[PDB]
Design an enzyme around this catalytic site. Structure first.
Site, PDB file in Angstrom:
ATOM      1  CG  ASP A  26       0.127  -3.851   3.075  1.00 46.42           C
ATOM      2  OD1 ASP A  26       0.645  -3.751   1.729  1.00 46.42           O
ATOM      3  OD2 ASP A  26      -0.149  -3.417   3.905  1.00 46.42           O
TER       4      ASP A  26
ATOM      5  CG  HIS B 118      -0.275   0.293   2.567  1.00 45.64           C
ATOM      6  ND1 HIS B 118       0.024  -0.825   3.490  1.00 45.64           N
ATOM      7  CD2 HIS B 118      -0.062   1.350   3.012  1.00 45.64           C
ATOM      8  CE1 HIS B 118       0.631  -0.308   4.533  1.00 45.64           C
ATOM      9  NE2 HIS B 118       0.381   1.318   4.377  1.00 45.64           N
TER      10      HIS B 118
ATOM     11  CG  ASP C 290      -0.354   0.382  17.304  1.00 45.20           C
ATOM     12  OD1 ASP C 290       0.452  -0.413  16.780  1.00 45.20           O
ATOM     13  OD2 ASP C 290      -1.447   0.635  17.225  1.00 45.20           O
ATOM     14  CB  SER C 291       3.473   0.947  13.973  1.00 45.56           C
ATOM     15  OG  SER C 291       2.457  -0.032  13.767  1.00 45.56           O
TER      16      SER C 291
ATOM     17  CB  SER D  32       2.911   2.020   6.220  1.00 43.26           C
ATOM     18  OG  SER D  32       1.446   1.683   6.763  1.00 43.26           O
ATOM     19  N   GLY D  33       5.372  -0.035   5.961  1.00 42.98           N
ATOM     20  CA  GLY D  33       6.482  -0.667   5.211  1.00 42.98           C
ATOM     21  C   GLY D  33       7.439  -0.901   6.095  1.00 42.98           C
TER      22      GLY D  33
ATOM     23  CD  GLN E 263      -2.096   6.413  10.391  1.00 43.26           C
ATOM     24  OE1 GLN E 263      -2.173   6.875  11.834  1.00 43.26           O
ATOM     25  NE2 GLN E 263      -2.776   5.409  10.524  1.00 43.26           N
ATOM     26  N   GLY E 264       3.017   6.858   8.884  1.00 47.58           N
ATOM     27  CA  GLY E 264       4.225   6.928   8.603  1.00 47.58           C
ATOM     28  C   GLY E 264       5.265   5.750   8.847  1.00 47.58           C
TER      29      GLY E 264
ATOM     30  CD  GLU F 171      17.943  10.502   6.273  1.00 48.20           C
ATOM     31  OE1 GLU F 171      18.587  10.979   7.116  1.00 48.20           O
ATOM     32  OE2 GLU F 171      17.566  11.103   5.171  1.00 48.20           O
TER      33      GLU F 171
ATOM     34  CB  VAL G 131      19.622  17.664  10.301  1.00 49.83           C
ATOM     35  CG1 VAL G 131      20.848  18.249  10.311  1.00 49.83           C
ATOM     36  CG2 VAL G 131      18.580  18.366  10.741  1.00 49.83           C
TER      37      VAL G 131
HETATM   38 CA   LIG Z   1      19.519  12.799   7.702  1.00 52.49          CA
END
Ligand SMILES: [Ca+2]
Lengths: 9, 223
Positions: free
Chosen positions: B84, B40, B171-172, B177-178, B174-175, B52, B57
């Site tokens: 998914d 999704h 919990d996990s 996902s994946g 929004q953002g 990252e 930054v």
């Molecule tokens: Ca960075």
């Protein structure tokens, strides 16, 4: 419902 | 991640950020050229950001690589979210180092109660929105299939499992996902969906990666 930006249901 | 902690810079070296002028999904590096994410999360114009921590930054260990291929599972269903899972090929191979490294695929499925590490740059609030600059982490157990199905009657397929806490607060979101659910050094889950975030009796639902190892390896070999 999904945890994406943005969410989907 | 709601109710998690700051991981620490580059402590989760397989965690990637999928970027389209903003972070919108996570993913997991499984070799120098391939990333596992959620179906999704599919969209065109993906840039994969590796190494990252602070995603706003430049800190010196980043690698930005465009996605050249995106392969959703052939039987993905966007209504049920069954299957998914998605594979992203990097336009060029990532340079592997201590801060950019792959996570192992599972050789067997995990059992209920196994502690796993869930990570991402998603919302940290169960009500409203606050998006972190740095990577967030959450230790969470896999729940029994019976509790998962009680939480979400009629919605849990054999390719899903629940993880987290029925009391709420962790919990996990929004953002996330994946991104990864890693248990004993294996990628057992992909952040997929849930009813809200960190809500009582509504744990997170995750793609059950151990069912897809053959498909993952064949897709890599043929693309
Ligand atoms: Ca960075």
């Amino acid at each position: 419902c999904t945890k994406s930006i943005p969410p989907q249901c | 991640i709601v109710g998690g902690y700051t991981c620490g810079a580059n402590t989760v070296p397989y965690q990637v950020s999928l970027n389209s002028g903003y972070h919108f999904c996570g993913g997991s590096l499984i070799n120098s050229q391939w990333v596992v994410s959620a179906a999704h999360c599919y969209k065109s114009g993906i840039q994969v950001r590796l190494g990252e921590d602070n995603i706003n930054v430049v800190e010196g260990n980043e690698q930005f690589i465009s996605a050249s291929k995106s392969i959703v599972h052939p039987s993905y269903n966007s209504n049920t979210l069954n299957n998914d899972i998605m594979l992203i090929k990097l336009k060029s191979a990532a340079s592997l180092n201590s801060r950019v490294a792959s996570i192992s695929l599972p050789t067997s499925c995990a059992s209920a109660g196994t502690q796993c590490l869930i990570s991402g740059w998603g919302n940290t609030k169960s009500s409203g929105t606050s998006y972190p600059d740095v990577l967030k982490c959450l230790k969470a157990p896999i729940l029994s299939d019976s509790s998962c199905k009680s939480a979400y009657p009629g919605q849990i397929t054999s390719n899903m499992f629940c993880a987290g806490y029925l009391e709420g607060g962790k919990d996990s979101c929004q953002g996330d996902s994946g991104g990864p659910v890693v248990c004993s050094g294996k990628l057992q889950g992909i952040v997929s969906w849930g009813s809200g975030c960190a809500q009582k009796n509504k744990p997170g639902v995750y793609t059950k990666v151990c069912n897809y190892v053959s498909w993952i390896k064949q897709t890599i070999a043929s693309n």
